[model samples]
Target: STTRRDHARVVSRSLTGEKFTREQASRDPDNYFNIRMLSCPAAEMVDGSEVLYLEQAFWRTPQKPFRQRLYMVKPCPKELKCDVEVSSYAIRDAEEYKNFCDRPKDQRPLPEEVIGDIGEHLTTIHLNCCDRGKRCLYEGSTSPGGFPNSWNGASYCTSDLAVLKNNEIHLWDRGFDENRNQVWGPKEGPYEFKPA
Candidate 1:
């Protein structure tokens, strides 16, 4: 059946002690190029933290630079093998993040605290944005059109969707504006594990 045949793309980036080559970095500029690091968020689990390894893949038109979109599957926690799905649309009317470097240091939106706070849990870190109207919000059933039916029967809830805004800062929030800017996160990224 179509449903069963529709396999989601899985990208895994394992962490390695070796330094990455510039060529390799260029290929996977968004940090999605390596299977090792792609599968692991960072080297060493932060005490009580869990990693949601994500794959970055998407389709785009033939336009110059290619209008690409990135999608990811949040890795299932160690105990629970359930897959967490997530994706971003097109980067249509957005500014390039690299441009921020020219701006004053104080004006930048990069979070001083790179790690996120997943309430009621230690070792488990939740990913979140540093500011407002910059990240992509997950469009679940609760959204205006309603949660996506594709997620029905999925093992994990979409509550902790991750949102990385134009500022290049990640956040966990609810919705976005007309221009498709918002803050949000998936609930599963921060927890230790849950029954599927």
Candidate 2:
């Protein structure tokens, strides 16, 4: 069994860096979004958790980010059915934090600034280590209830994630209405993202 620290470390390291959905977008431009993302370890640590700074935008517009978040990763408790837990948070002033990962280490926002800037709670993903001999690393999904979201007239949304070797990530997020109808996101599978 992997220790808590080891589990957290693996998940954190695997998620840090840059990724893009160029191939997938090229194949299915209408359905898949051509998005680019940058994730890095944040300076802050809370109760031994690995905090990450993540920002994503359309590939053509790197300067204007569409999504900015903070991910707090830690080992799950005994009751949970996973090894690691990843919680996402929104930034208070996301415009100011645009292109955060591209900035130099010293020029990036300080730990205190990030801590103070955290805003809404997004979703919590429960990740379990998956060993496929360097092919797969981790797979996870949000809880059944998911989290509140109003985008495109959605009431709540759920997210699924897969962290793979060779710097690849697959992510799918879908929003649901009060009647449980699909309101937003793709009807197809997750967006395949490979290292840029």
Candidate 3:
């Protein structure tokens, strides 16, 4: 139980603040996206999972978020070999949840309302503890040929995420056509995010 507790705690806390892709964005503005991840306030669920309001935006326009989701952080199921399973859910009304991390506590939606707002189930990233002396805490990816994604004439999308130490994160997302051709996301590698 303690191990699961630690796994759930670290996964939630590590992704709980602001992080930015400043360096990569500045270096390769054309290829890599200048993303900002705001994983704020956890609305604890009665089932022991922590649901976080996640909003991602272009660094140039933090007010205009491009992606908004509710990340459900829970311990991996017993059948799975991973330590944690972070499931992404699309929000029903993204406009209302914009600038979620910057809003006052009273202005934010209640846990039950958030639960009600959960829309399409996106994809779940399976994470396990890294090696004893690694720089990362947990690293994982979605199953091959991941969840359905209709963007850019693509059939599906896959996401790779690493929860590193010091609240740093490395995230890579790609979309593929039905024939397995890459459609979207970075060609270089995962976008690195440091605390901002």
Candidate 4:
């Protein structure tokens, strides 16, 4: 329930070129998504936003054989400081890759390739990588409509303070503010990168 699955799916799409290969075609049969709207878990900073809809295992990566991560962060319309999104993705193995380890970095399969394209939609390693150094680790694919469908929201699993303190892996000092004010607030600390 970390950023691995989301990030993996994004990375897997980047591996493929624009056109679908025989391998991608054969794997499309299993390429499925499970979209749902759940109660929003964000703090008061979200203006009491009610619910969050997430599409698990979303497909349609930009081209095949090679894609790039589309990473971004947006602040809340109301609270620019407290409420912010740190987006990330899942991590997984390439199901059909018998030689995954030896494969070049270019061909490595992410969560998308390992699951839908080969096996099931698997969620292995999820991490919060919103720091200045790794914040750019992201990829983009069109939604059912287009770019207009993009929504930046973090996960309830990642937003939980329990996970924030218990699991040090996902926690990080990843938030910042460019507010017209002098500096920052008590909002700095370990947090998830999967965001709006």
Model 1 misplaced regions, further than 4 Å: 1-10, 14-63, 70-72, 77-81, 89-93, 98-196
**What lDDT score goes with residue 29 in model 1?**
52
Which pairs, if any, clash in model 2? none
Per-residue lDDT of model 2, residues 92-161, tens digit only? 8887777777778778788878877788889999988886574568888887878999887789999998
Q: Compared with the true structure, what per-residue lDDT tens digits does model 4 show for residues 159-181?
A: 21111121111222111223222
**Model 2 spans > 4 angstroms off:** 131-135
lDDT by residue for model 1 (1-196), tens: 3120121111212111111223443554554222111112221233322233222212121112221222233433445323323332222232332222234445532322112221121111222222345433221222233222222233222233332222111222233333333333233222111111
Q: Give the TM-score of each candidate.
A: 0.20, 0.90, 0.93, 0.17
Q: Pick the lDDT winner.
A: 3
**True lDDT of residue 116, candidate 2:** 76
lDDT, candidate 4, at 59: 31
Deviation (Å) of 176 in candidate 4: 28
TM-score-superior candidate, 2 or 4: 2
Error of 3 at 178 (Å): 0.6
Candidate 3, which ten residues in sequence have the lowest lDDT sum? 1-10
The lDDT for every candidate, in the order shown, is: 0.25, 0.83, 0.87, 0.25
Q: Between prediction 1 and prediction 4, which has the larger TM-score?
A: 1
